[PDB]
Design a protein around this nucleic acid. Structure first.
Ligand SMILES: [Mg+2]
Ligand SMILES: [Mg+2]
Ligand SMILES: [Mg+2]
Ligand SMILES: [Mg+2]
Ligand SMILES: [Mg+2]
Ligand SMILES: [Mg+2]
Ligand SMILES: [Mg+2]
Ligand SMILES: [Mg+2]
Ligand SMILES: [Mg+2]
Ligand SMILES: [Mg+2]
Ligand SMILES: [Mg+2]
Ligand SMILES: [Mg+2]
Ligand SMILES: [Mg+2]
Ligand SMILES: [Mg+2]
Ligand SMILES: [Mg+2]
Ligand SMILES: [Mg+2]
Ligand SMILES: [Mg+2]
Ligand SMILES: [Mg+2]
Ligand SMILES: [Mg+2]
Ligand SMILES: [Mg+2]
Ligand SMILES: [Mg+2]
Ligand SMILES: [Mg+2]
Ligand SMILES: [Mg+2]
Ligand SMILES: [Mg+2]
Ligand SMILES: [Mg+2]
Ligand SMILES: [Mg+2]
Ligand SMILES: [Mg+2]
Ligand SMILES: [Mg+2]
Ligand SMILES: [Mg+2]
Ligand SMILES: [Mg+2]
Ligand SMILES: [Zn+2]
Lengths: 208, 234, 138, 150
RNA sequence: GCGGUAAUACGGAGGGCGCGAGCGUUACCCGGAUUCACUGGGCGUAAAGGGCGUGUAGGCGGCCUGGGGCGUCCCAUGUGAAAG
RNA sequence: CAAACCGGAUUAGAUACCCGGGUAGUCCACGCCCUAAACGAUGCGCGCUAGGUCUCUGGGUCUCCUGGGGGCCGAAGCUAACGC
């Protein structure tokens, strides 16, 4: 997807299992288990107290590097979520989570988001029966996210959905397998996601 | 536990070195001396003695502080009469706010007297014997009845607010209620329970602490007689 | 001379309370009095009354404080924490009804003078006028 | 129990014949995040001691802060020395918008949404002593009503 | 503020942080700067009381009542193009 | 009496401090000059907010009370502090 580099060296910088890879991250790796310290020749010496700033910075990185998104595109969302009405923090989360590239991951078509990004850019994903090849596209509520009719018997997709048979998908998403079809029921609320981010902090970093 | 026309001669006192804050409790400037509003001395006494009652009933202690020499001896008897402790010679920096650290001096006195009932007063070099026996001297001299205190007291009775003002300040910083025998040179508002009498002149002083300790015993359970002091005040 | 007689009073009061007087005397005017009417109503004083010193007419204000307090410094809380002239000579301050200020989220008042007469902030807004913003009190 | 933060530690220095002789100071805050905060200034010979000392100092000197939905009753401004602090209530979602010193104090008090301005001298010590005073001075409609009844 | 022979501050290397079809630089405007302060500052010793008076214009002006309604406040109504 | 100046000393030098002289000047009148650490380094007016003590000058029932002026100490409060 974007960033396109070593992802698990980011798991190892945030000191958190980030799952930027899905499958193997559940193995005995994700980088974290076995070697859970920072990347670089130095990331194993006694860590100095993070400045007030680093703390709020590293926390944003933790959120942005999850959804795999340019800072230019992250901040654009945050500012919008800011101007918007409601707890500007959770509206932000609502917005990231409303992204098509991510909703495809949530409905387990891809096993990662990097994989879900490409699944869209290569046109295997449809919204409301029309095709959408933009990771950015904002899913609204009531929309149905299908797997493209002529993409259905594809290898990467088959394994990915026989694995989805018998698994639960978020309380704000519908999903029927065999039909390769989801449904965006509602914008998730703050306690619906289990993100390892303070998020309150992310707001503070964008007013430094 | 009363007397109203115990003006006697112990009503008004002090000239014009007054705290103007003491203006309510004064009657007139009868010839260079403010004389104390007689009535108020008796009705402040009402609400005051009332206070002290509930203190003896609940089983708490009152630290009697009087350093002024014209009241010094009187404090010793009336404070010994009641179980309560007294500060009599001089008042030390942190009897209360430093009450732990100060009590090491108590930890030593009680323990240094234990040296003087042992075979080790014959043992130990006389280099120690002279020093460690004239050290016990001074200890018993200041803490003769501070040692009775094992924790901070529930209240504190001072005979001169102005003069023992370090005692007062320490009480407040630890929120310990101040009873005080006050007159025209003092700041009444700095005191919780006031007996607007006169800090100096034994004829007052003792009368007050007599009747007060009367009341303390009377309310604890003992109902007693005349005092070791009384008209033995000359 | 006495250039602002309202500030004189407002102040006279501020001064008296900070040394905890029982009452204080201001020389009298209906307009001054019409303010004390509000001070009194809203709980800031105990009330006032036209006394008479040396044969000239004053308004004795009766001040009001908290209860005695704890620790060092037992001087009670003030009731009139804060009280200050807004409009003054050579800077008169007038406000529309849409501009009458919310003082301390209403924990305090703001007396103003309108053509319906002297009034609190809440009074004018819930009565539709504006006027010369006299003073905040909180 | 209580949460400790520590706003600055510094290394003061005095002169004695032949050399300077050092010392350390620590400003620390304690809070239960439910309306209680304490500010402690602990000076002492070596660093971690000066912290310990502050924490203790900070626990006497507590302020009972009257939170309301994460913010404050009125808006105070306070002068301590040449430092001025300005506190302003804000609706939910605003966050602590504050300089790094009253932030320490406010977050630990449990204010989750507020507006702030440091005005005048910005000495971190006097600024801390000021927001403490600002907090000490908050009244609610509850306690104001008591004041002006009778 | 670093460099005077053990440089995390110079030049290279490995590693790391930040953005990324961009990233840096210089220039300019507002911000932080309550640092021209109306909101929101000061002048005994930090910059700042005129050497002192007399007084012109101007600014400001005690208590009570009545008229007017300029300031001030309120209601209605017209105007405030489109773009932004 | 004393800038400049003329001498004597001192000194490494001594265009200075010390010593002996000495002109303007210092004084007066009239006319200019308009400065200053022209200082309380604190503009003028009025109102308010504990007291104590010393002093100058009024008044009254004259142990004291009541004005005006000059100091000191201090309540509240203020001040970066000193202080006020
Ligand atoms: Mg005395
Ligand atoms: Mg200031
Ligand atoms: Mg500054
Ligand atoms: Mg080298
Ligand atoms: Mg070096
Ligand atoms: Mg280097
Ligand atoms: Mg550098
Ligand atoms: Mg800004
Ligand atoms: Mg500006
Ligand atoms: Mg300035
Ligand atoms: Mg100078
Ligand atoms: Mg100057
Ligand atoms: Mg002058
Ligand atoms: Mg001039
Ligand atoms: Mg000048
Ligand atoms: Mg004039
Ligand atoms: Mg004129
Ligand atoms: Mg005029
Ligand atoms: Mg007028
Ligand atoms: Mg008229
Ligand atoms: Mg008109
Ligand atoms: Mg338009
Ligand atoms: Mg001569
Ligand atoms: Mg000569
Ligand atoms: Mg000539
Ligand atoms: Mg002349
Ligand atoms: Mg005479
Ligand atoms: Mg005088
Ligand atoms: Mg003071
Ligand atoms: Mg001071
Ligand atoms: Zn991983």
């Amino acid at each position: 997807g974007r960033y396109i580099g070593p992802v698990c060296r980011l798991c190892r910088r945030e000191g958190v299992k980030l799952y930027l890879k899905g499958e193997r991250c559940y193995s005995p790796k994700c980088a974290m288990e076995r070697r859970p310290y920072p990347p670089g020749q130095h990331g194993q010496k006694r860590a100095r107290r993070p400045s007030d700033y680093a703390v709020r910075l590293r926390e944003k990185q933790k959120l942005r590097r999850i959804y795999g998104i340019s800072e230019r595109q992250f901040r654009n969302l945050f500012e919008e979520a800011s101007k918007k009405k409601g707890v500007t923090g959770s509206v932000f989360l609502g917005l990231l989570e409303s992204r098509l590239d991510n909703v495809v991951y949530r409905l387990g078509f891809a096993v990662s988001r990097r994989q879900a990004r490409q699944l869209v850019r290569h046109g295997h994903i449809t919204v409301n029966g029309r095709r959408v090849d933009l990771p950015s596209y904002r899913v609204r509520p009531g929309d149905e996210i299908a797997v493209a009719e002529k993409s259905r018997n594809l290898e990467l997709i088959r394994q990915n959905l026989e694995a989805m048979k018998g698994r639960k998908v978020g309380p704000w998403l519908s999903l029927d397998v065999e039909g390769m079809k989801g449904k965006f029921l509602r914008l998730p609320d703050r306690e619906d996601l289990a993100l390892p981010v303070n998020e309150q902090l992310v707001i503070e970093f964008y007013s430094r | 536990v009363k007397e109203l026309l115990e003006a006697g001669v112990h009503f008004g006192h002090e000239r014009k070195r007054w705290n103007p804050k003491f203006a309510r409790y004064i009657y007139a400037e009868r010839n260079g001396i403010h004389i104390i509003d007689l009535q108020k001395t008796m009705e402040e006494l009402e609400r005051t003695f009332r206070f002290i009652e509930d203190l003896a009933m609940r089983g708490g202690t009152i630290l009697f502080v009087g350093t002024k020499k014209q009241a010094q001896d009187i404090v010793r008897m009336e404070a010994e009469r009641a179980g309560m402790p007294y500060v009599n010679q001089r008042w030390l920096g942190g009897m209360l706010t430093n009450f732990k650290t100060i009590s090491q001096r108590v930890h030593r006195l009680e323990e240094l007297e234990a040296l003087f009932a042992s075979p080790e007063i014959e043992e130990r070099p006389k280099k120690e014997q002279v020093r460690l026996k004239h050290e016990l001297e001074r200890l018993q001299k200041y803490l003769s009845g501070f040692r009775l205190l094992k924790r901070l007291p529930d209240a504190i009775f001072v005979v001169d607010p102005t003069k023992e003002a370090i005692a007062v300040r320490e009480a407040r910083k630890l929120f310990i209620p101040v009873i005080a025998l006050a007159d025209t040179d003092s700041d009444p508002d700095l005191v919780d329970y006031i007996i607007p009498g006169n800090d100096d002149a034994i004829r007052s002083i003792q009368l007050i602490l007599s009747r007060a300790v009367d009341l303390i015993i009377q309310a604890r359970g003992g109902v007693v007689e005349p005092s070791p002091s009384y008209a033995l005040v000359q | 001379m006495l250039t602002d007689p309202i500030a004189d009073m407002l102040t006279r009061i501020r001064n008296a309370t900070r040394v905890y007087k029982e009452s204080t005397d201001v020389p009298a005017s209906r307009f001054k009095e019409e303010i004390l009417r509000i001070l009194a109503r809203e709980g800031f004083i105990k009330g006032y009354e036209r006394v008479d010193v040396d044969g000239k007419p004053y308004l004795r204000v009766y001040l009001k404080y908290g209860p005695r307090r704890q620790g060092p410094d037992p001087r009670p809380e003030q009731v009139i924490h804060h009280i200050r002239r807004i409009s003054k000579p050579g800077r008169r301050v007038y406000v529309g009804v849409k501009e009458i200020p919310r003082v301390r989220r209403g924990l305090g008042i703001a007396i103003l003078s309108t053509s319906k007469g002297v009034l609190t902030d809440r009074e004018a807004r819930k009565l539709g006028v504006g006027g010369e913003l006299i003073c905040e009190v909180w | 129990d209580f949460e400790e933060k520590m706003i600055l530690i510094r290394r003061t220095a005095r002169m004695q014949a032949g050399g300077r002789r050092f010392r350390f100071g620590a400003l620390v805050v304690v809070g239960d995040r439910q309306g209680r905060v304490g500010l402690g200034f602990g000076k002492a010979p070596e660093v971690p001691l000066a912290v310990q000392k502050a924490g203790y100092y900070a626990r006497r000197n507590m302020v009972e802060v009257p939170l309301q939905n994460g913010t404050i009753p009125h808006e105070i401004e306070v002068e301590f020395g040449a430092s001025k602090i300005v506190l302003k209530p804000a609706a939910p979602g605003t966050g602590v918008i504050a300089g790094a010193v009253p932030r320490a104090i406010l977050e630990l008090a449990g204010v989750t949404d507020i507006l702030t301005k440091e005005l005048g001298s910005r000495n971190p010590i006097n600024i801390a002593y000021a927001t403490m005073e600002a907090l000490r001075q908050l009244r609610t409609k509850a306690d104001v009503e008591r004041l002006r009844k009778g």
